[PDB]
């Protein structure tokens, strides 16, 4: 019925100080909102993007919002984008909104242009938390290299990891076109020094070249992006989720989620399947909010025993909810976690 913070932090420090156990990370949208460049946040959260789209764009937008809200709660950018692409799947879909089509195709391009111009914010000086994480990554010559998964569309991880030049590999091989490779993902025959970074929700520099229906990464073009959450193309998403699932099956695997809101659906299910398949897997869920705001996380914690969910005020461990011993546990904030990692690095 009661827990103490110090013992939990001591256990986590003991865990992170072992090189035998493979380690990974989840950098969701809650990390960029934790750093301030101007008076406004450097990158707003999903609610910020929804508000910006609402106040920036009108009648057909409100009609679409009403149609989706008729059976769903407060929406996100992913919801409206998926709805738009689903409408684009049907050829004569312009009669649903009485817009005769051919206008949604331009509205989605305008939204993509706005998002891609807004997310390009550049990184501030070398004091960023991501720089500390990158420095911690190469500090120790671990025999199992640390993998990183990010749901962010931006490129803060790239800039931070290149400012302190470190081994890196994201799946694309090449110099001019950087053609996406699938085989080299599957044999996993790479030297242990090379780090692995994988973007589950897609980046902003990804361009669909069409024609031969091939994917390539590189310089970000204007308007042409691949921001798709999942899409339904006839794919990086499926193979990359398979890679995550394969990682979760490794013996004595540790995965830490920072700034993740657990509101996604496929990610939660694959995490639950990985936890149930191998009982030796262990997931550290780190949040910065009241625990009552994560119902799916509570259900997963009450279902899967080897999932540790830690919130600001309460914490549920081993299918038993409790409260901290005299908000506490500031480790949920990205800045505090980065400071913790950089102090444990030395």
């Amino acid at each position: 019925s009661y827990y103490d913070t110090t013992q939990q932090l001591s256990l986590l420090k003991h865990v992170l100080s072992e090189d035998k156990r493979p380690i990974a990370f989840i950098i969701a949208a809650g990390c960029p909102v934790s750093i301030r460049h101007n008076d406004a946040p450097l990158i707003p959260d999903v609610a910020g993007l929804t508000r910006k789209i609402s106040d920036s764009f009108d009648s057909l937008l409100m009609k679409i919002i009403q149609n989706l809200k008729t059976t769903i709660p407060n929406p996100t950018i992913e919801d409206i984008l998926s709805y738009i692409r689903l409408l684009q799947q049907i050829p004569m879909s312009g009669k649903i909104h009485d817009v005769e089509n051919s206008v949604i195709n331009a509205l989605e391009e305008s939204i993509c242009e706005l998002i891609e111009e807004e997310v390009n914010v550049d990184l501030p000086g070398n004091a960023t938390p991501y720089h500390k994480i990158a420095a911690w990554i190469n500090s120790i010559n671990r025999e199992h290299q640390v993998e990183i998964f990010t749901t962010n569309y931006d490129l803060l991880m790239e800039q931070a990891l290149e400012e302190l030049n470190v081994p890196y590999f994201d799946g694309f091989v090449g110099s001019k076109r950087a053609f996406f490779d699938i085989r080299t993902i599957e044999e996993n025959k790479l030297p242990s020094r090379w780090s692995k970074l994988w973007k589950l929700h897609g980046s902003i520099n990804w361009q669909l070249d069409k024609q031969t229906q091939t994917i390539w990464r590189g310089t970000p073009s204007k308007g042409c992006s691949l921001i798709h959450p999942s899409h339904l193309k006839y794919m990086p998403y499926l193979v990359m989720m398979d890679q995550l699932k394969l990682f979760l099956n490794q013996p004595s695997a540790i995965l830490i989620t920072c700034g993740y809101s657990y509101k996604d659906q496929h990610i939660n299910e694959v995490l639950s399947q990985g936890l149930q398949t191998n009982p030796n897997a262990l997931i550290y869920g780190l949040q910065y909010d009241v625990l009552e705001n994560y119902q799916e996380a509570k259900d997963m914690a009450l279902k899967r025993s080897n999932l540790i969910l830690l919130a600001k005020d309460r914490a549920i461990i081993g299918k038993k909810e409790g409260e901290w011993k005299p908000l506490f546990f500031k480790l949920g904030d990205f800045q505090h976690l980065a400071s913790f990692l950089e102090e444990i690095s030395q």
């Binding site: 009661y2 827990y3 103490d4 013992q7």
Partner: protein, 99 residues
């Protein structure tokens, strides 16, 4: 399924599997439902367990505290005296200290 009682009944044989005691098992061991016992601290291994100590035997039988001067015995005695003489739980305490 009754409780933890000292003294075994039948001894193990060759090949019996040896496990490790988990925190709920420790709660089962170091826990009791008697109203006399009072929590004074936490076990060293895991801090979620209360250290239940009887108070009738502590006073009626006798007590003694022994340790080096650098081990902070004064703080331990102060904490023990403050816990025994809680106003909300023991309004009729009676203690004399020969400082």
């Amino acid at each position: 399924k009754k409780e933890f009682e000292r003294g075994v009944s039948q001894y193990p044989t060759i090949g019996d599997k040896v496990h490790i005691v988990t925190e709920p098992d420790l709660k089962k061991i170091y826990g009791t439902q008697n109203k006399k016992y009072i929590s004074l601290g936490n076990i060293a291994s895991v801090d979620s367990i209360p250290a239940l100590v009887n108070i009738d035997t502590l006073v009626t039988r006798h007590s003694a505290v022994l340790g080096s001067t650098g081990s902070g015995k004064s703080t331990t005695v102060t904490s023990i005296l403050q816990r025994i003489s809680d106003m909300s739980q023991f309004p009729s305490a009676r203690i004399i200290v020969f400082d």
